[PDB]
């Protein structure tokens, strides 16, 4: 939970990324290499390591999904694991249906349908993201973790569709 404490923030999903940046930079200055240029190698190294820690904490807290995954790790969840899969079986089937549709859109080379598909997936990502935030606020950790896993699946679907768009018509 130290990542939050480091930035003097409460362990919650809601936070000011703007205020987070100013504090991250304040901390970062403390470990600027010039401050230890005249020091031993162990000193210069330690500064590098502390700098690394500050950056790991900042990256984790700044990223919406990483921030949620971190918060959940403080409550017995390891979203990094693989043996722990999505419990919402309907969601798995939904993702396969949507992917089969994307393949059809590709075969038809339909730009308008692809644009629509992309926006619809992005909208669902935003809606499920809102649901996760609500679940974290409600402190229903199990539910929040499953939604977080769903968001990871949706993000990949979204990125795959956007990659297709940059090609679609084929020359």
Swiss-Prot record:
GO terms for biological process: [2Fe-2S] cluster assembly; protein complex oligomerization; protein folding. SMART domains: DnaJ. InterPro entries: DnaJ_domain, HscB, HscB_C_sf, HscB_oligo_C, J_dom_sf. Keywords: Chaperone. Belongs to the HscB family. Co-chaperone involved in the maturation of iron-sulfur cluster-containing proteins. Seems to help targeting proteins to be folded toward HscA. Interacts with HscA and stimulates its ATPase activity. Interacts with IscU. This is Co-chaperone protein HscB. It comes from Escherichia coli (strain K12).
């Amino acid at each position: 939970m130290d990542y939050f404490t480091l930035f003097g923030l409460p362990a919650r999903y809601q936070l000011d990324t703007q205020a987070l940046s100013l504090r991250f930079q304040d901390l970062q200055r403390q470990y600027h290499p010039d401050k230890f240029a005249s020091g031993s190698q162990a000193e210069q190294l330690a500064a590098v390591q502390q700098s690394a820690t500050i950056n790991q904490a900042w990256q984790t807290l700044r990223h919406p999904l990483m921030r949620a995954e971190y918060l959940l790790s403080l409550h017995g969840f390891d979203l990094a694991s693989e043996q722990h899969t999505v419990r919402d079986t309907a969601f798995l089937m939904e993702q396969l249906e949507l992917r089969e549709e994307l393949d059809e859109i590709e075969q038809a080379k339909d730009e308008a349908r692809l644009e629509s598909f992309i926006k619809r997936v992005k909208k669902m990502f935003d809606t499920r993201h809102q649901l996760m935030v609500e679940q974290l606020d409600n402190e229903t950790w199990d539910a929040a973790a499953d939604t977080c896993r769903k968001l990871r699946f949706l993000d990949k679907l979204r990125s795959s569709a956007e990659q297709l768009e940059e090609k679609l018509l084929d020359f």
